[PDB]
Amino acid sequence: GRLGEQEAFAMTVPLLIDVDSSQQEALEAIALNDELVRVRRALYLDLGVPFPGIHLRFNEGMGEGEYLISLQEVPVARGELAGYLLVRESVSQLELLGIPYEKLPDQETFWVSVEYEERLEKSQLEFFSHSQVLTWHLSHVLREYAEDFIGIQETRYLLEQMEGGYGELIKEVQRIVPLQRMTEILQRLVGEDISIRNMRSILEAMVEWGQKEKDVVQLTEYIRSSLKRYICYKYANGNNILPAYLFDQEVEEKIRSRVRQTSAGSYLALDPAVTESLLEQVRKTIGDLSQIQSKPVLIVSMDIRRYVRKLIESEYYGLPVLSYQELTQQINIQPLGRVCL
Amino acid sequence: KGRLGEQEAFAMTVPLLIDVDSSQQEALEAIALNDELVRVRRALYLDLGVPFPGIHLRFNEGMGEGEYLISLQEVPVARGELKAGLVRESVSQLELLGIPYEPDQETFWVSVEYEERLEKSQFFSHSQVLTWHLSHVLREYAEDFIGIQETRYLLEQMEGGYGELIKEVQRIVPLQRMTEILQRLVGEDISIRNMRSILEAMVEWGQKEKDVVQLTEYIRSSLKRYICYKYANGNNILPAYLFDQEVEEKIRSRVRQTSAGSYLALDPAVTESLLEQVRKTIGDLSQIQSKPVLIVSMDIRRYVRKLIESEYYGLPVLSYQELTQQINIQPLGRVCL
Amino acid sequence: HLERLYPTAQSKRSLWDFASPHRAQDYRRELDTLQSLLTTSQSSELQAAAALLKCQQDDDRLLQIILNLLHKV
Amino acid sequence: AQSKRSLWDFASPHRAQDYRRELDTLQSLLTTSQSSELQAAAALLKCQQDDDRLLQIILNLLHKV
Amino acid sequence: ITLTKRQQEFLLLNGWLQLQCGHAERACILLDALLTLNPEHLAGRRCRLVALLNNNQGERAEKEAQWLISHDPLQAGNWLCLSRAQQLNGDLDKARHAYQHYLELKDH
Amino acid sequence: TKRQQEFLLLNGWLQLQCGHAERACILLDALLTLNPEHLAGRRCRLVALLNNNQGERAEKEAQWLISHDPLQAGNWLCLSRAQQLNDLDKARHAYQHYLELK
Secondary structure, X not given: OOOOOOOOOOOOOOEEEXXXXXXXXXXXXXXXXXXXXXXXHHHHHHHOOOOOOEEEEEEOOOOOOEEEEEEOOOEEEEEEOOOOOEEEEOOOOHHHHHXXXXXXXXXXXXXXXXXXXXXXXXXXXXXXXXXXXXHHHHHHHHHHOHHHHOOHHHHHHHHHHOOOOOHHHHHHHHHHXXXXXXXXXXXXXXXXXXXXXXXXHHHHHHHHHHOOOOOXXXXXXXXXXXXXXXXXXXXOOOOOEEEEOOEOHHHHHHHHOOOOOOOOOOOOOOOHHHHHHHHHHHHHHHOOOOOOOOOXXXXXXXXXXXXXXXXXXXXXXXXXXXXXXXXXXXXXXXXXXOEOO | OOOOOOOOXXXXXXXXXXXXXXXXXXXXXXXXXXXXXHHHHHHHHHHHOXXXXXXXXXXXXXXXXXXXXXXXXXXXXXXXEOOOOOOEEOXXXXXXXXXXXXXXXXXXXXXXOOHHHHHHHOOEOHHHXXXXXXXXXXXXXXXXXXXXHHHHHHHHHOOOOOHHHHHHHHHHOOHHHHHHHHHHHHOOOOOOOOHHHHHHHHHHHHOOOOOHHHHHHHHHHOOHHHHHHHHOOOOOEEEEOOEOHHHHHHHHOOOOOOOOOOOOOOXXXXXXXHHHHHHHHHOOOOOOOOOOEEEEOHHHHHHHHHHHOOOOOOOOEEEOOOOOOOOEEEEOOOEOO | OOOOOOOOOHHHHHHHHHHOOOOOOXXXXXXXXXXXXXXXXXXXXXXXXXXXXXXXXXXXXXXXXXXXXXXXX | OHXXXXXXXXXXXXXXXXXXXXXXXXXXXXXXXXXXXXHHHHHHHHHHHHHHHHHHHHHHHHOOO | OOOOOOHHHHHHHHHHHHXXXXXXXXXXXXXXXXXXXXXXXXXXXXHHHHHHHHHOOHHHHHHHHHHHHHHOOOXXXXXXXXXXXXXXXXXXXXXXXXXXXXXXXXXX | OOOHHHHHHHHHHHHHHOOOOHHHHHHHHHHHHHOOOOOHHHHHHHHHHHHHOOHHHHHXXXXXXXXXXXXXXXXXXXXXXXXXXXXXXXXXXXXXXXXXXX
């Protein structure tokens, strides 16, 4: 107010959700304050990333069903949820034509009225309500942008919360590696959908391998390999069965030939034409199988594992990449196909 | 409760969890369900000495009727559906055909009405099978229960007993190396319980050797009589499958101590041939009893062990230095080349 | 906990449950027996099955060579 | 001003990886046609097709790790 | 001719993986070989029904679902396979009837 | 050209939004010569012609939209602008007509 006060500085909110008005009290009292904490708690228990507080505001400037999720006051997921009285369906197909009713970062979405809800729930299909679709978008945003929630402050909070539990372990790991390297390792772990939750084994691996390796890539590969049984349970389906798309030795050597560890980055730039040919070979062998299940994983030599992942992250964001060291024993690895050259 | 302004309300993962089906909250527990677990844990600790963590027991109704799962750090490591609901027997054979008819054991299930007559023939109950799986998990995964905090707790518990010994061993070797040595010792089913001799060996040999493999081999050799008693139930008789000099030299030729890993990487065909020769000599070990042990040169002992850990996980590997005197070493067969 | 908020396409779950029906070395043993059994056959379908088994038998031979070369201590 | 905004609103009318080979199909369709307007359109499309080939090569050479 | 042994289960497991890991043709080949050798098995035909549905072979899936419907008793998932296969071929009304039968039977 | 026409519309709109307007004009002329029913292309190219200073053609196109799509009052700004590029009294009449419609 005063024209002598300097600026009245205020920090930007980390996470904001702006939804349209006319749902301030039309939506209130139906979850929206327990569902959000429920989904955040579930995602944290699955991952371990200390997500921040969520600010919810009702803005009348926009339309009637526009919701936007913004991280640090920059919108990252917008959408107009249709939505007012039409609940969405994610497995809409010619089956939805078989039951004839009127019909986004989610899967195939089609909207149906609430009068159709009874007969369609007799068929037991998806009935995402407003809370369900909002929390689904929130969960997707948190999962794909969790790296932005792992700062120095967050890692320090995690260490301080476990001081009573493992004091000497924390004191040793702090003297072995700094906060910056540890936080970068945690971010790289979360970027591969590896849960931070089991911090004890992570700290033990950090202690064991931080004295030997100083490069971040090799250290995080060792920490990944320290989670053999967790990775095995997370990716293998059925009993001791792990689907694999193992790489040929020639392709691995060709990829490894251009590690380029010049400026502590180690970017994998071989040739645009050569990488195009390798990606074409991977596409021809693996195939697409997007509609199919069981989450097959690519298994390659450890020293280049991450370098392979970002090579195929553009097209096959699903397919994980694993190291031979990361595999525990008593596993029947079934090779779905070798990526030839 | 978690408001939408609270950051995360962090909570640490439980180390060991056992989730069993519901409808046995009050149908079970008749025997102990809370004393048997501590009894078996205490017995296994006395056998080994590893400070196992607390066990969290929960009854979940989302699963079936006889499904029990044992998980280490919220990762399931041993799942199974007991069909007792029908007690089981582990010595099932064709003898069960001459009697009322119907893990890593001969597991067949029999009804409770046969229990008397089968006890006339000469029994794992629900508690017994649950504790059997728990014991197998704890023994085969004890290395995951030895952290820096656990070793520090063990050292602090013995400060009153041997203060100067602990103060000297701490100044000689660090916590990380000491914990890794203890884990390597436990990986061979060598008991930590006798900490005095372990600490004395650590003091004596930590100033001379810095490699973890050689130091832990020396600490193993410091337990000659313990190893002799553990592996020789007879009267100074120790079954042996001694290695030839040529095979030992060939194995030693690829120690590869380049990045303090010490990986044993020979030609795959060479390791296949050596394993084939070992299999031809030793045999299948299925009908073999009395727990025969392989005895090889100390400097490569571990290198041999991890070479045969894939097939013969039973058969232990011992060093010549680990052998005390007054032992009648009986060679069951030499591993030729 | 494990993001158990999506029913995951109930019709697809019923399909997978209808389709829904282990060891360490029994697998490689069964692979070798089946591949040598089907090699003696003469049917084209059995020929394709035998070729698939040989394919997996040798992708496994390559991964066994990679596992043998890699090791710890 | 407001009138200029109204002009832009009068002119005003999928996203992300929708940009695919539809461009290439249209460019090869218009390449066959003998119409001068379609020829100018095809040349404009070839221009963008190769500016995109250059930026894809630059992104491949840089990337990240 | 030939034999089954425990081997018949291997063909199932490998076939199952091939179906769940985007190899419908490989799973179909394995289960067809299994049935051509041992036709008495039933779980293999259950797997190949879903394999044929994912492979886009409507007539073959319909025929296999007809066999299982005439041999597998009630509560079977044999009315989804018929519905999915036939709705790929057309004839939406019988697919609707199969779906309503499945819903009526699942209430039990 | 059912989907492809939408790609052409989006490209023309973006080119109009980025100062060229010549590329937008050629793309939308190709669109109208192929699919004339989709009048949104003509709607964009009218403003493109206004920004290109080709009011003679803009008057004819605005007359087409005015005599065939009276669902848009904006059809009376472009004509006015077109005649203002070339007739100030008729521009005032067109602007007053737009004011009557809005």
